[PDB]
């Protein structure tokens, strides 16, 4: 019962899920910053 | 006679390679090779070397094999690459000579009459001079003693021609000491000298003990030479020298004193100049 | 598509460098060449242990200069002594020209590469490498069919700009256009440095020799005279203490002159020479009777 | 059996180089190199020294030093690598081996493979196995099957060389 909940949350199932639910729900990455870098790449090893 | 056998850096760096080539798999004693080099007035120049298949047995100390054709053919190639080198002797990294050295030296006498064997103590890294050069002489021992083969000793010194010198200097480039010396390194040069003089004197003591305890033969010669060194001592207690030593020690202290004062006035002047510097900037901040 | 990561290194043993430099200076007016013996330990490292000179011939540094009879026999004889290494590349000097490969050299390199895709080619200018600097760049032909892809085809790595930057005196003779340099790193190890340290090592006797007092007194007298004149300026330089922007005075009179540089600089020399000499004097008085 | 990506070095064994010591005339060296019941026995003693040579530098992963289950199979195997000269029995015991191996009874079986330290064998040109005893302490030991598993190291065969591009008689 509850211990099964305790095991479920000590192993880290919940933290990642909530931590996953956070980042997915609160995500905001300015893709514009990458674009000016992708177009500014001179095709050098900076593609990596 | 050969006044010196100047061993170039490249040879002792190929021998080291030669020792590693074999000892890594075929664990064995001394590795024997041939020593090429150009002659001089009397100082034999060792400029290169190569290995010769050499196998020996601890039994009978004369079941060996120093290949002839390999020695002949190798040199056949090298005189093609460089023609200023002639076979001049052999090298073995076994620190202590063997009973097989005389017989094998007679062989290398077949390629160079004035053959000099240079023992490179590849394994040790110690006080210094990892080369010991030997010749072959058969004399009546003037002073009424049996004749025999024996290896006479020839002074060895390690030098470098221009090309190898440039490579060596860069090759270290991480442990080389400053050439200027400085007070730190000069003093270490003396703790090093004291350690040697003791070390050389201790080898002398052990041998003198050996002759004293009989375990070794009284040379009757070179034995009294050590007696020569024992008379060449200074006897400083002499008054006329004792006065003359204080004068030069006093002659120098007045220069270290003048040197000391200059370094002090400069020191104070630098603090006064600095005390003004931070103070003036201190007021100027406001 | 395999690629020579810039991290790839051509390890040069302490033996090879002395022997390669020795050969170069041996025929310095002309150009010398020889095969290098080593192992391709893996993709990112080409290790060269020994080098053996291929005899100078009128052809020069070209494929023809590689005498197959000389090389086949020499290899055969080095295998008995305990060096069963494989021909890992070739080297040739360049009497002062630089560290670059000419057209004819390129054709050679393409030949060596025919037998193994990693046969590195080096240079070794015995005239420029005259001091602590050793001008020896390694090179591997960048096959011309890889113009579609990236030249110097490296991948994840970061030691490309390290240990060197593209030398100008070579970039003009075809680099990153037909030949690329490979980082050269020397595999000096203990038991080899120690034996080379003996080149200029002094001895036990040195350090106890007391110099000679006749030229020591002259030297002490000489330097004290020279420092004296330098004090005269020190008095004039300080006693002037002119305050017309003294910070600017200390920068408009900088010519390696009186104030300090020709000052205690001599004090260190004068005081080091005496202290060492004196300490040697007293040590000898104790050790030798 | 064999591991992934590695091949037996039977094709790479230089018949010219290989030589056994103490091999009996009736059962010679060639017998133990065939995957048959034919085997090799040591005539003068249990000690045997079977050396092989490879055409080009090979690498070593796993040798199969199989032996008869009568007890005359190998027990202690000393391996040397790239020996400049042939080995001597007296000097072979003295010298330190590249990998001192204590065969166990499980190894001698027909299916047994003995793993070697892959790191130590990277440029082997000639390997010498030294059988220092057989399981049953019998007068003569036996090697039912013996071959090496690894990969071939690409060697630059300078004998071929041959110009591939360019014109002859061209100088610097
Ligand atoms: Zn060239």
Short mmCIF file of C-alpha atoms in Angstrom, two decimals, chain B:
data_model
loop_
_atom_site.label_atom_id
_atom_site.label_comp_id
_atom_site.label_asym_id
_atom_site.label_seq_id
_atom_site.Cartn_x
_atom_site.Cartn_y
_atom_site.Cartn_z
CA UNK B 1 97.55 4.56 -26.77
CA UNK B 2 94.28 6.52 -26.88
CA UNK B 3 94.25 9.61 -24.68
CA UNK B 4 90.45 9.82 -24.71
CA UNK B 5 87.41 8.05 -26.11
CA UNK B 6 84.76 10.75 -26.53
CA UNK B 7 81.41 8.98 -26.63
CA UNK B 8 78.80 10.97 -28.51
CA UNK B 9 75.26 11.15 -27.10
CA UNK B 10 73.76 9.13 -29.95
CA UNK B 11 75.67 5.95 -29.10
CA UNK B 12 74.56 5.81 -25.47
CA UNK B 13 71.03 6.43 -26.69
CA UNK B 14 71.20 3.55 -29.17
CA UNK B 15 72.77 1.20 -26.63
CA UNK B 16 69.94 2.03 -24.24
CA UNK B 17 67.65 1.17 -27.13
CA UNK B 18 69.70 -1.96 -27.78
CA UNK B 19 69.39 -3.08 -24.17
CA UNK B 20 65.65 -2.49 -24.24
CA UNK B 21 65.22 -4.33 -27.54
CA UNK B 22 66.35 -7.62 -26.02
CA UNK B 23 65.99 -7.46 -22.25
CA UNK B 24 62.31 -6.78 -22.82
CA UNK B 25 61.82 -10.37 -24.01
CA UNK B 26 65.07 -12.32 -23.90
CA UNK B 27 66.13 -11.48 -20.36
CA UNK B 28 69.91 -11.58 -20.59
CA UNK B 29 73.10 -9.96 -19.32
CA UNK B 30 75.30 -7.51 -21.23
CA UNK B 31 74.24 -6.67 -24.78
CA UNK B 32 77.28 -6.53 -27.06
CA UNK B 33 77.57 -4.29 -30.09
CA UNK B 34 80.07 -2.66 -32.36
CA UNK B 35 81.25 0.92 -31.95
CA UNK B 36 81.97 2.98 -35.05
CA UNK B 37 83.72 6.31 -35.11
CA UNK B 38 86.33 8.53 -36.67
CA UNK B 39 89.89 8.73 -35.44
CA UNK B 40 91.74 11.85 -34.34
CA UNK B 41 95.27 12.67 -33.23
CA UNK B 42 94.75 10.27 -30.34
CA UNK B 43 91.16 10.86 -29.17
CA UNK B 44 88.85 8.24 -30.63
CA UNK B 45 85.49 9.71 -31.61
CA UNK B 46 82.52 7.40 -31.16
CA UNK B 47 79.76 8.60 -33.48
CA UNK B 48 77.43 5.62 -33.94
CA UNK B 49 76.92 1.95 -33.20
CA UNK B 50 74.82 -1.09 -33.99
CA UNK B 51 73.90 -4.38 -32.39
CA UNK B 52 75.47 -7.77 -33.06
CA UNK B 53 73.70 -11.02 -32.15
CA UNK B 54 75.51 -12.15 -29.02
CA UNK B 55 74.63 -15.18 -26.93
CA UNK B 56 76.60 -16.43 -23.95
CA UNK B 57 76.50 -19.17 -21.34
CA UNK B 58 77.29 -18.98 -17.63
CA UNK B 59 79.01 -22.36 -18.05
CA UNK B 60 82.69 -22.39 -19.01
CA UNK B 61 82.38 -18.63 -19.64
CA UNK B 62 83.61 -19.25 -23.17
CA UNK B 63 80.57 -20.69 -24.96
CA UNK B 64 79.62 -17.45 -26.72
CA UNK B 65 78.84 -16.30 -30.25
CA UNK B 66 79.55 -12.86 -31.70
CA UNK B 67 78.35 -13.07 -35.28
CA UNK B 68 81.00 -12.31 -37.89
CA UNK B 69 78.86 -11.97 -41.01
CA UNK B 70 76.37 -9.71 -39.25
CA UNK B 71 79.24 -7.53 -38.08
CA UNK B 72 80.80 -7.56 -41.55
CA UNK B 73 77.57 -6.96 -43.43
CA UNK B 74 76.24 -4.27 -41.08
CA UNK B 75 79.41 -2.25 -41.51
CA UNK B 76 79.16 -2.92 -45.23
CA UNK B 77 75.90 -1.00 -45.15
CA UNK B 78 77.03 1.75 -42.80
CA UNK B 79 80.17 2.68 -44.74
CA UNK B 80 77.71 3.21 -47.59
CA UNK B 81 75.53 5.52 -45.49
CA UNK B 82 78.52 7.32 -43.97
CA UNK B 83 82.15 6.74 -44.90
CA UNK B 84 83.88 8.56 -42.04
CA UNK B 85 83.14 5.70 -39.63
CA UNK B 86 85.43 2.72 -39.12
CA UNK B 87 84.89 -0.07 -36.61
CA UNK B 88 86.76 1.01 -33.49
CA UNK B 89 85.60 -1.19 -30.61
CA UNK B 90 82.68 -2.78 -28.83
CA UNK B 91 80.28 -1.98 -26.00
CA UNK B 92 78.57 -4.07 -23.36
CA UNK B 93 76.10 -2.88 -20.74
CA UNK B 94 77.04 -5.50 -18.16
CA UNK B 95 78.47 -3.26 -15.47
CA UNK B 96 81.27 -5.69 -14.52
CA UNK B 97 83.60 -7.08 -17.16
CA UNK B 98 83.32 -10.77 -18.01
CA UNK B 99 85.86 -13.50 -18.52
CA UNK B 100 84.80 -13.49 -22.18
CA UNK B 101 85.94 -9.92 -22.84
CA UNK B 102 89.57 -10.70 -23.66
CA UNK B 103 88.77 -13.41 -26.19
CA UNK B 104 86.06 -11.34 -27.85
CA UNK B 105 88.29 -8.28 -27.87
CA UNK B 106 90.85 -10.31 -29.81
CA UNK B 107 88.10 -10.79 -32.39
CA UNK B 108 87.36 -7.08 -32.69
CA UNK B 109 91.11 -6.62 -32.98
CA UNK B 110 90.65 -8.40 -36.29
CA UNK B 111 88.67 -5.41 -37.52
CA UNK B 112 90.49 -2.57 -35.75
CA UNK B 113 93.90 -3.17 -34.15
CA UNK B 114 93.51 -0.34 -31.61
CA UNK B 115 90.16 -1.64 -30.40
CA UNK B 116 88.63 0.07 -27.37
CA UNK B 117 85.71 -1.48 -25.50
CA UNK B 118 83.33 1.00 -23.89
CA UNK B 119 81.23 -0.35 -21.03
CA UNK B 120 77.95 1.56 -20.90
CA UNK B 121 76.17 0.97 -17.59
CA UNK B 122 72.77 1.41 -19.18
CA UNK B 123 70.86 0.14 -16.15
CA UNK B 124 72.46 2.44 -13.55
CA UNK B 125 71.75 6.16 -13.39
CA UNK B 126 74.02 7.46 -10.67
CA UNK B 127 76.91 9.82 -9.87
CA UNK B 128 77.65 9.98 -13.58
CA UNK B 129 79.75 9.08 -16.59
CA UNK B 130 77.93 5.95 -17.78
CA UNK B 131 80.84 4.99 -20.08
CA UNK B 132 84.06 3.16 -19.19
CA UNK B 133 86.61 2.66 -21.97
CA UNK B 134 89.18 -0.16 -22.01
CA UNK B 135 92.01 -1.28 -24.30
CA UNK B 136 94.05 -4.47 -24.66
CA UNK B 137 97.72 -4.60 -23.67
CA UNK B 138 100.04 -7.58 -23.24
CA UNK B 139 103.16 -6.50 -21.36
CA UNK B 140 105.84 -8.30 -19.38
CA UNK B 141 104.75 -6.34 -16.28
CA UNK B 142 108.27 -4.91 -15.92
CA UNK B 143 108.23 -5.74 -12.22
CA UNK B 144 108.71 -9.49 -12.52
CA UNK B 145 105.19 -10.93 -12.54
CA UNK B 146 103.32 -13.33 -14.84
CA UNK B 147 102.16 -12.03 -18.20
CA UNK B 148 98.49 -11.99 -19.14
CA UNK B 149 95.90 -10.25 -21.30
CA UNK B 150 94.23 -7.76 -18.95
CA UNK B 151 92.30 -4.63 -19.98
CA UNK B 152 94.12 -1.34 -19.49
CA UNK B 153 91.98 1.72 -18.84
CA UNK B 154 91.59 4.76 -21.11
CA UNK B 155 90.07 8.05 -19.99
CA UNK B 156 86.47 8.40 -21.13
CA UNK B 157 84.55 11.60 -21.70
CA UNK B 158 81.08 12.22 -23.10
CA UNK B 159 80.81 14.96 -25.71
CA UNK B 160 78.52 16.09 -28.49
CA UNK B 161 78.94 17.27 -32.05
CA UNK B 162 76.79 20.18 -33.17
CA UNK B 163 73.92 18.24 -34.72
CA UNK B 164 73.28 15.88 -31.81
CA UNK B 165 73.79 18.79 -29.42
CA UNK B 166 70.78 20.63 -30.81
CA UNK B 167 68.64 17.51 -30.57
CA UNK B 168 69.77 16.71 -27.05
CA UNK B 169 69.20 20.23 -25.75
CA UNK B 170 65.61 20.17 -26.94
CA UNK B 171 65.26 16.54 -25.94
CA UNK B 172 65.58 17.46 -22.28
CA UNK B 173 64.00 20.92 -22.39
CA UNK B 174 62.21 20.10 -19.14
CA UNK B 175 64.96 19.27 -16.62
CA UNK B 176 67.91 21.30 -17.88
CA UNK B 177 69.43 23.55 -15.24
CA UNK B 178 70.12 27.20 -15.93
CA UNK B 179 73.64 27.71 -17.26
CA UNK B 180 74.14 30.80 -15.07
CA UNK B 181 74.24 28.64 -11.96
CA UNK B 182 73.01 31.19 -9.44
CA UNK B 183 73.72 30.79 -5.73
CA UNK B 184 71.19 27.98 -5.36
CA UNK B 185 72.72 25.73 -8.01
CA UNK B 186 76.35 26.60 -7.25
CA UNK B 187 76.00 25.42 -3.65
CA UNK B 188 74.27 22.23 -4.77
CA UNK B 189 77.31 21.80 -6.99
CA UNK B 190 79.34 21.52 -3.79
CA UNK B 191 77.12 19.24 -1.72
CA UNK B 192 77.34 17.13 -4.86
CA UNK B 193 81.12 17.35 -4.89
CA UNK B 194 81.40 16.45 -1.22
CA UNK B 195 79.17 13.43 -1.76
CA UNK B 196 81.39 12.24 -4.59
CA UNK B 197 84.74 12.79 -2.89
CA UNK B 198 83.38 10.71 -0.02
CA UNK B 199 82.07 8.14 -2.49
CA UNK B 200 85.38 7.93 -4.32
CA UNK B 201 87.24 7.79 -1.01
CA UNK B 202 84.96 4.97 0.12
CA UNK B 203 85.72 2.88 -2.96
CA UNK B 204 89.38 3.48 -2.11
CA UNK B 205 88.83 2.38 1.48
CA UNK B 206 87.08 -0.85 0.54
CA UNK B 207 89.89 -1.79 -1.83
CA UNK B 208 92.53 -0.84 0.74
CA UNK B 209 90.61 -3.02 3.17
CA UNK B 210 90.62 -5.81 0.59
CA UNK B 211 94.39 -5.60 0.13
CA UNK B 212 94.71 -5.14 3.89
CA UNK B 213 92.66 -8.29 4.50
CA UNK B 214 94.46 -10.04 1.64
CA UNK B 215 91.31 -10.72 -0.36
CA UNK B 216 92.93 -8.81 -3.23
CA UNK B 217 96.47 -8.68 -4.65
CA UNK B 218 98.76 -5.88 -3.56
CA UNK B 219 99.16 -4.18 -6.91
CA UNK B 220 102.62 -2.91 -5.91
CA UNK B 221 101.78 -0.24 -8.47
CA UNK B 222 98.92 2.25 -8.39
CA UNK B 223 98.91 1.18 -4.73
CA UNK B 224 101.66 3.67 -3.91
CA UNK B 225 100.10 6.17 -6.31
CA UNK B 226 97.28 6.35 -3.81
CA UNK B 227 100.19 7.03 -1.48
CA UNK B 228 101.10 9.89 -3.80
CA UNK B 229 97.65 11.43 -3.32
CA UNK B 230 98.18 10.96 0.40
CA UNK B 231 101.26 13.19 0.38
CA UNK B 232 99.78 15.89 -1.88
CA UNK B 233 97.53 17.10 0.95
CA UNK B 234 97.68 20.81 1.78
CA UNK B 235 98.71 20.94 5.47
CA UNK B 236 96.65 24.07 6.06
CA UNK B 237 97.64 24.35 9.72
CA UNK B 238 100.85 26.04 8.53
CA UNK B 239 100.93 29.51 10.03
CA UNK B 240 102.16 31.31 6.93
CA UNK B 241 99.23 29.87 4.98
CA UNK B 242 96.78 30.44 7.83
CA UNK B 243 97.56 34.14 7.65
CA UNK B 244 97.32 34.13 3.86
CA UNK B 245 93.91 32.48 3.96
CA UNK B 246 92.34 35.01 6.30
CA UNK B 247 93.61 37.78 4.04
CA UNK B 248 91.81 36.41 1.00
CA UNK B 249 88.74 35.45 3.02
CA UNK B 250 88.89 38.98 4.41
CA UNK B 251 89.66 40.30 0.94
CA UNK B 252 86.37 38.84 -0.27
CA UNK B 253 84.15 39.69 2.68
CA UNK B 254 84.74 43.40 2.09
CA UNK B 255 83.30 42.88 -1.38
CA UNK B 256 80.28 40.91 -0.17
CA UNK B 257 79.85 43.65 2.42
CA UNK B 258 79.91 46.35 -0.25
CA UNK B 259 77.63 44.13 -2.31
CA UNK B 260 75.37 43.72 0.71
CA UNK B 261 75.18 47.46 1.39
CA UNK B 262 74.29 48.37 -2.19
CA UNK B 263 71.47 45.83 -2.12
CA UNK B 264 70.25 47.34 1.14
CA UNK B 265 70.24 51.01 0.13
CA UNK B 266 68.49 49.96 -3.07
CA UNK B 267 66.03 48.06 -0.90
CA UNK B 268 65.25 51.04 1.31
CA UNK B 269 65.07 53.37 -1.68
CA UNK B 270 62.56 50.98 -3.20
CA UNK B 271 60.40 51.01 -0.08
CA UNK B 272 60.56 54.80 0.20
CA UNK B 273 59.67 55.09 -3.47
CA UNK B 274 56.87 52.59 -2.88
CA UNK B 275 55.69 54.21 0.35
CA UNK B 276 55.35 57.43 -1.64
CA UNK B 277 53.62 55.53 -4.44
CA UNK B 278 50.77 54.02 -2.42
CA UNK B 279 50.50 57.06 -0.14
CA UNK B 280 50.37 59.50 -3.06
CA UNK B 281 47.75 57.30 -4.73
CA UNK B 282 46.13 57.15 -1.30
CA UNK B 283 45.67 60.92 -1.12
CA UNK B 284 45.00 61.18 -4.86
CA UNK B 285 42.05 58.80 -4.47
CA UNK B 286 40.13 61.43 -2.49
#
